[PDB]
Design an enzyme around this catalytic site. Structure first.
Site, PDB file in Angstrom:
ATOM      1  N   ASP A 173      45.893  41.642  14.242  1.00 15.62           N
ATOM      2  CA  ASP A 173      44.643  41.223  13.564  1.00 15.62           C
ATOM      3  C   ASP A 173      43.487  42.097  14.086  1.00 15.62           C
ATOM      4  OD1 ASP A 173      43.045  39.810  11.749  1.00 15.62           O
ATOM      5  OD2 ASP A 173      42.577  38.251  13.231  1.00 15.62           O
ATOM      6  N   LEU A 174      42.358  42.136  13.369  1.00 19.29           N
ATOM      7  CA  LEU A 174      41.160  42.866  13.842  1.00 19.29           C
ATOM      8  C   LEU A 174      40.277  41.939  14.682  1.00 19.29           C
ATOM      9  CD1 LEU A 174      39.972  45.802  13.375  1.00 19.29           C
ATOM     10  CD2 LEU A 174      38.366  44.631  11.891  1.00 19.29           C
ATOM     11  N   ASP A 175      39.674  40.935  14.066  1.00 18.30           N
ATOM     12  CA  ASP A 175      38.658  40.074  14.724  1.00 18.30           C
ATOM     13  C   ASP A 175      39.341  39.266  15.834  1.00 18.30           C
ATOM     14  OD1 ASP A 175      36.094  38.892  15.098  1.00 18.30           O
ATOM     15  OD2 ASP A 175      36.713  37.233  13.769  1.00 18.30           O
ATOM     16  N   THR A 194      34.135  40.767  14.685  1.00 19.01           N
ATOM     17  CA  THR A 194      33.438  40.820  13.377  1.00 19.01           C
ATOM     18  C   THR A 194      32.712  39.495  13.147  1.00 19.01           C
ATOM     19  OG1 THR A 194      35.374  40.049  12.157  1.00 19.01           O
ATOM     20  CG2 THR A 194      35.068  42.447  12.337  1.00 19.01           C
ATOM     21  N   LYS A 229      34.303  29.943   9.393  1.00 19.92           N
ATOM     22  CA  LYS A 229      35.441  30.822   9.770  1.00 19.92           C
ATOM     23  C   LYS A 229      36.712  30.372   9.031  1.00 19.92           C
ATOM     24  CE  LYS A 229      33.676  31.912  14.383  1.00 19.92           C
ATOM     25  NZ  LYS A 229      34.310  32.677  15.488  1.00 19.92           N
ATOM     26  N   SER A 265      44.944  42.185   8.881  1.00 21.71           N
ATOM     27  CA  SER A 265      43.581  41.569   8.888  1.00 21.71           C
ATOM     28  C   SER A 265      43.143  41.201   7.465  1.00 21.71           C
ATOM     29  CB  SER A 265      42.576  42.496   9.515  1.00 21.71           C
ATOM     30  OG  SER A 265      41.249  42.061   9.292  1.00 21.71           O
ATOM     31  N   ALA A 266      42.428  40.086   7.308  1.00 25.76           N
ATOM     32  CA  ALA A 266      41.780  39.707   6.028  1.00 25.76           C
ATOM     33  C   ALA A 266      40.490  40.524   5.853  1.00 25.76           C
ATOM     34  CB  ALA A 266      41.550  38.207   5.941  1.00 25.76           C
ATOM     35  N   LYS A 292      46.196  33.660   5.811  1.00 26.61           N
ATOM     36  CA  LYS A 292      46.563  32.945   7.062  1.00 26.61           C
ATOM     37  C   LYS A 292      46.122  31.495   6.882  1.00 26.61           C
ATOM     38  CE  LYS A 292      45.690  37.164   9.622  1.00 26.61           C
ATOM     39  NZ  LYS A 292      44.879  37.872  10.634  1.00 26.61           N
ATOM     40  N   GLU A 304      47.174  37.861  17.918  1.00 24.95           N
ATOM     41  CA  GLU A 304      46.184  37.012  17.221  1.00 24.95           C
ATOM     42  C   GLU A 304      45.482  36.106  18.227  1.00 24.95           C
ATOM     43  OE1 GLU A 304      44.304  36.323  14.976  1.00 24.95           O
ATOM     44  OE2 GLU A 304      45.187  36.487  12.912  1.00 24.95           O
ATOM     45  N   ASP A 305      44.306  35.615  17.844  1.00 26.38           N
ATOM     46  CA  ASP A 305      43.504  34.679  18.666  1.00 26.38           C
ATOM     47  C   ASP A 305      43.316  33.346  17.949  1.00 26.38           C
ATOM     48  OD1 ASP A 305      41.683  35.804  16.750  1.00 26.38           O
ATOM     49  OD2 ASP A 305      40.000  35.198  18.014  1.00 26.38           O
TER      50      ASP A 305
END
Ligand SMILES: [Mg+2]
Length: 219
Positions: free
Chosen positions: A8-10, A16, A45, A114-115, A145, A169-170
């Protein structure tokens, strides 16, 4: 041994979330709605732009035309896109660059799941494009997700099955998506949020090639 790592990115590569919050608060201020704070923002979120705007409009019980609604959503995104023009390699989370260097040298595929509609842009700005073998296009995935679709897509795009992959992932949603793809999740955060049944590290400095190899062997 695993053949790919699905990022994932964020909350994994960078933040982000802060920029989304600022874009929504700026927008809320313009149309004179109070109560868009970081606490309220937890309700934004994981929801769609449209659904988030609707939640902000419900604060003041404000109605808008379909046209104005579409315009407000667009403004918020234009604001977001201006703010991420600041993103640089300085915003790469601890350990992530070295992890990507080690994965690449060890011929392990790297995919973004990532979304973010700005994933490619954000990877270019942080100078990480060269490490990624694929970015899954969120506009081509049917379900967000915690559905596994985007992790499946990221794995297929680098020529592996999710079963051959680790997912980083977080978020609760993110961990559930990885698990249902058949990939092995390694969480970053707190067991109280992400569950007792997966391996979790307190922060991204612990995501090392050696640690990933240990986790894969141990199950
Ligand atoms: Mg995340």
């Amino acid at each position: 041994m695993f053949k790919a790592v699905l990022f994932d990115l964020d909350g994994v590569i960078t933040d982000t979330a802060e920029y989304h919050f600022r874009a929504w608060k700026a927008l809320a201020e313009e149309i004179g709605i109070n109560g868009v704070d970081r606490q309220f923002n937890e309700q934004l979120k994981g929801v769609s732009r449209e659904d988030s705007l609707q939640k902000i409009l419900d604060l003041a019980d404000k109605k808008v035309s379909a046209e104005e609604f579409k315009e407000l959503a667009k403004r918020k995104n234009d604001n977001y896109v201006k703010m991420i023009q600041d993103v640089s390699p300085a915003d790469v989370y601890p350990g992530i660059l070295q992890l990507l260097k080690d994965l690449r040298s060890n011929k392990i595929k790297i995919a973004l799941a990532s979304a973010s509609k700005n994933g490619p842009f954000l990877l270019e700005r942080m100078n990480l494009t060269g490490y990624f073998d694929a970015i899954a296009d969120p506009a081509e995935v049917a379900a967000s997700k915690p559905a596994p679709d985007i992790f499946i897509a990221a794995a297929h795009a680098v020529g592996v099955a999710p079963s051959e992959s680790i997912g980083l992932e977080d978020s609760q949603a993110g961990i559930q998506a990885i698990k249902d793809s058949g990939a092995l999740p390694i969480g970053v955060g707190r067991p109280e949020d992400l569950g007792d049944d997966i391996v979790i590290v307190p922060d991204t400095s612990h995501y090392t090639l050696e640690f990933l190899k240990e986790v894969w062997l141990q199950k």
